[PDB]
Amino acid sequence: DPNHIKVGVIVGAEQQVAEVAQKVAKDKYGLDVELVTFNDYVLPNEALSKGDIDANAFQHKPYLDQQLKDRGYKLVAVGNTFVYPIAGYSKKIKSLDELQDGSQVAVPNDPTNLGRSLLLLQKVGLIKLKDGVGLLPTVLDVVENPKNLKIVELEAPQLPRSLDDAQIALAVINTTYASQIGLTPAKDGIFVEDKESPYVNLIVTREDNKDAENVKKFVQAYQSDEVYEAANKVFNGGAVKGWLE
Ligand code: MET
């Protein structure tokens, strides 16, 4: 079907935003966009690589690059979407003043979002990392940890439910999944990453279909004021436009 494109997205608020892009694509081009929904960060790139979908819209470039290295995919970015500054959340404390020694702190376990989380924990002064780590520090790079915090690495989609675990005092959670239980950085975050970061999300395709006319249309539909306005609402200001104005 030459007027049909399948795009992989994550359930929750990101799916809602993608639905607006779907609408713009229909209204502006009469393009038939099908959203294929996922609730993890691994299967969407598998689906794309295998040709089960044409594009996906869920990852930032460090993540993409790591996926190319680790899985050997031939994928490429065809457009920016939003930066989603990541936040630390808790259902046990309201401030770092209350963080007890020995507390478990949950973070994503994939290399780039793990690194990102550790950099955030360093930024707010809870830990110090070795020099030269760049974007990919690991827990082995922690050189100061005065509260003797225990970093608990979890699959990203598990981070929202981790908040209810009896020992998890703090969790760094992608807004993707935080939004599934109605949390946003501005409303619920104890601390939040700077808007300026390398983590703008992407629309990604295979090398072989990066220039497909339907891909170009979808990118233009997503990169629209209508989509921004929707994102800014549902993410309560936690979505920064990543494309050229
Ligand atoms: C799969 S990389 C992480 C993407 C997620 N939406 C974020 O920007 O935190």
UniProtKB/Swiss-Prot annotation:
Location (main, coarse): membrane
How does the protein associate with the membrane? Answer: Lipid-anchor
Please tell me whether the keyword tRNA processing is annotated for this protein.
Answer: no
Q: Which SUPFAM superfamilies match?
A: Periplasmic binding protein-like II
Gene Ontology BP term (one) = D-methionine transmembrane transport
Q: Note the superkingdom of the native organism.
A: Bacteria
Q: Which InterPro entries match?
A: Lipoprotein_NlpA
Q: Which UniProt keywords apply?
A: Amino-acid transport, Cell membrane, Lipoprotein, Membrane, Palmitate, Signal, Transport
Where located? Answer: Cell membrane
One GO cellular component this record assigns the protein to is:
outer membrane-bounded periplasmic space
Task: State the remark under miscellaneous.
Answer: The MetNIQ system is also to be able to transport the toxic methionine analog alpha-methyl-methionine.
Mind telling me which PANTHER family this protein's record contains? D-METHIONINE-BINDING LIPOPROTEIN METQ (PTHR30429), D-METHIONINE-BINDING LIPOPROTEIN METQ-RELATED (PTHR30429:SF1)
Q: What the protein does?
A: This protein is a component of a D-methionine permease, a binding protein-dependent, ATP-driven transport system.
Q: Which protein family is named in the record?
A: Belongs to the NlpA lipoprotein family.
Protein name in UniProt: D-methionine-binding lipoprotein MetQ
Could you tell me which species this protein originates from?
Answer: Escherichia coli (strain K12)
